[PDB]
Amino acid sequence: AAGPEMVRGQVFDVGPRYTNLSYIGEGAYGMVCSAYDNLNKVRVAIKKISPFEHQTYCQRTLREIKILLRFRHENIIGINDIIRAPTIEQMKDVYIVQDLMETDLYKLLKTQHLSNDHICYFLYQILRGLKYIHSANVLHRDLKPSNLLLNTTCDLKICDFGLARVADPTRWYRAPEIMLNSKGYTKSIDIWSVGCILAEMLSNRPIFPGKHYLDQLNHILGILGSPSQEDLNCIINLKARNYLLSLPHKNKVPWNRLFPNADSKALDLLDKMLTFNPHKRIEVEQALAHPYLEQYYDPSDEPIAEAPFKFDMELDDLPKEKLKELIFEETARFQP
Numbered sequence: 256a257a258g259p260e261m262v263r264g265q266v267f268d269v270g271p272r273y274t275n276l277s278y279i280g281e282g283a284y285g286m287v288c289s290a291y292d293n294l295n296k297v298r299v300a301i302k303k304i305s306p307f308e309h310q311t312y313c314q315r316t317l318r319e320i321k322i323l324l325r326f327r328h329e330n331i332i333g334i335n336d337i338i339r340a341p342t343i344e345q346m347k348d349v350y351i352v353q354d355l356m357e358t359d360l361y362k363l364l365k366t367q368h369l370s371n372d373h374i375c376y377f378l379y380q381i382l383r384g385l386k387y388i389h390s391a392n393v394l395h396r397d398l399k400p401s402n403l404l405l406n407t408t409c410d411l412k413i414c415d416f417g418l419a420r421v422a423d424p425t426r427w428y429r430a431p432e433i434m435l436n437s438k439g440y441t442k443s444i445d446i447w448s449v450g451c452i453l454a455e456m457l458s459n460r461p462i463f464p465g466k467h468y469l470d471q472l473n474h475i476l477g478i479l480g481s482p483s484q485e486d487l488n489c490i491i492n493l494k495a496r497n498y499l500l501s502l503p504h505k506n507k508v509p510w511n512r513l514f515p516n517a518d519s520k521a522l523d524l525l526d527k528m529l530t531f532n533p534h535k536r537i538e539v540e541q542a543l544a545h546p547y548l549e550q551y552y553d554p555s556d557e558p559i560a561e562a563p564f565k566f567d568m569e570l571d572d573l574p575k576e577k578l579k580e581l582i583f584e585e586t587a588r589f590q591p
């Protein structure tokens with residue numbers, strides 16, 4: 256049929272295996288289409304990426320592929336297949352094939368009230384995938400509703416691991432310690448994000464929607480109030496600590512005034528996730544065992560990674576041509 260299929264001007268060269276192309280999205284260098292996998296007789300999502308001229312875009316691509324080839328968990332989108340040219344010279348583009356999901360949490364939150372069972376079930380599933388990621392000693396680092404994919408039966412998968420890193424322990428879902436001291440290197444960063452997502456499910460409305468960089472921190476303290484003395488001591492960067500002190504006092508807005516209609520158990524969980532001090536922040540295993548998730552919590556049915564990562568390339572500084580090379584090698588699993 257014709258030649259290489261074309262979607263909105265962009266070449267989508269996915270051989271005869273995948274046909275019936277239909278546009279879904281365009282997150283910069285990466286267009287997402289749905290397709291029909293003629294081998295497996297299913298419909299799939301296919302992401303086209305062209306990272307090879309940007310070290311950063313190569314690092315995200317390598318990281319995502321490396322991680323996701325190694326992960327196997329129901330609440331994490333897996334990689335079915337990767338398509339690419341037989342020679343690194345001709346490898347200009349990379350197509351990642353994954354399960355077609357039906358919607359995402361962001362989309363879903365702009366159209367629907369979530370019943371408490373649903374919020375509970377989505378939360379559960381987020382935390383279940385998170386437990387597996389963290390057992391692998393990996394930080395997602397970019398949890399937000401658009402990275403939470405949903406099917407018609409409410410199965411939830413975590414997506415986009417391009418910012419993931421081996422733990423070294425949008426702006427709206429960023430832990431405050433990332434704004435404050437180092438480049439945020441604890442698992443509690445992900446828990447924070449999940450608190451933001453929880454709050455968003457409770458009200459259909461982002462909890463800390465900072466319009467600019469320092470505003471994000473004002474939204475956070477607007478709600479949690481000024482950090483306590485002990486909490487100030489965890490900000491160990493000179494300029495951040497002093498900045499915190501230069502801020503006018505702020506009251507802690509109680510959770511039931513922001514969410515008058517929420518399950519009080521959900522709000523208790525929310526509190527522990529949206530804890531300023533990262534050391535006092537609830538961890539994933541305790542989050543799952545919280546009373547709020549009582550009906551889904553099943554630790555015999557919450558797999559962990561068999562072995563934790565410890566990255567065989569981290570601190571990169573690798574040139575693009577080198578990253579491309581590893582991307583070529585890691586994508587080789589899938590070549591004829």
Ligand SMILES: */C1=C/C(=O)[C@@H](O)[C@@H](O)C[C@H]2O[C@@H]2c2cc(OC)cc(O)c2C(=O)O[C@@H](C)C1
Pocket residue numbers: 279280282287300301302332353354355356357358359401402404414415
């Ligand atoms: C999953 C990570 C992302 O890129 C997200 O930002 C995601 O929101 C993008 C979104 O296009 C995907 C998408 C959309 C639908 O229909 C709503 C179904 C899908 O299966 C996917 C998908 O699989 O996204 C993957 C490729 C990336």
